[model samples]
Target: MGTPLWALLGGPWRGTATYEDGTKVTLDYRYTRVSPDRLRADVTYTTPDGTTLEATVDLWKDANGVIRYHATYPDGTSADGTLTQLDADTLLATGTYDDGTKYTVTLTRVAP
Candidate 1:
């Protein structure tokens, strides 16, 4: 309903979520401010199997006023997509994984 909170997302956050299949994952995300319109996010996710997936997410607020996302996985898979901030502490990002699996990642800041 307003300018995507992409700007406020420029900080460190920690949270967890469970998938529909009952898999629980914990995340530690750090967003670094690189410039006025660019940010770099390092995300680490711990799976139920005790394995961890690390990814580097590059976000750009383009001149066209669109927030673009690019991510590189540890497995050498890369994907690009767009993000729309739903509010101050929520964002909805829909994109395709490296394996071409469509995904909608909803990130929310946990209330303290």
Candidate 2:
């Protein structure tokens, strides 16, 4: 309603996620704006096994200020999620995959 959430979220962010089994994944995220209401994010995930997976997502905010995104991976898997901006430098995302697994992610902007 004030400055769009995308304005504050556009940049590089880094975080880590711990799975139910205690496996940890390191994440690197970068977001860029395509328009006032649209953004593109590239994310790299480093799994505990040392494998790296990458995904890209298209994010947009509706007129009602709800943030939504769709993501695709090279392995033919896709995901969708809602984004909650926690502050000028933080975001929380919850999403589910086609395999019925759900994950929660938190990202904090990298200091310039």
Candidate 3:
């Protein structure tokens, strides 16, 4: 494999996600290399109420270099989103819920 996307993306990332409704959560995400075109994302979210939430998102890129992600929440809800950009030490992940509610997470590299 040439330069795997995971090679550039697999790492510990920490950030916070804010919803349009003013809700926010602290996120600790770790991406593991699964293949040249795939990654296993372990997500840990700390809610405003101090509750810990979790999800494992599968990220994969097709031959066309289009990246997509999928995850199932603890509430039996499933969702999919696109992997948009990683600029320097920052990454922007955007997604929409089934109810049309949307969010974008700004993650920073947590590695030294």
Task: State model 2's lDDT.
Answer: 0.75
Candidate 1 has an lDDT of 0.73
**Each model's lDDT:** 0.73, 0.75, 0.68
Candidate No. with top lDDT: 2
- Cα displacement (Å) at residue 26, model 1: 2.8
Ranking by lDDT: 2, 1, 3
Clashes of each: 0, 0, 0
Across residues 1-112, which tens digit of lDDT does each residue of candidate 3 receive? Answer: 3234674465557765655576756778777657766788778888777888788888887776666788768887766776555666655677766667766765555556
Residue-wise lDDT of candidate 1 within 36-68, one digit each (tens)?
667888988887868888989898877677788
lDDT of 2 by residue, 1-112 (tens): 6347556464547766655575657778877547776888788988776888999989888777878788999998999887787786666778888888878876555566
| Count of clashes in candidate 1 | 0
Tell me the TM-score of model 2.
Answer: 0.75
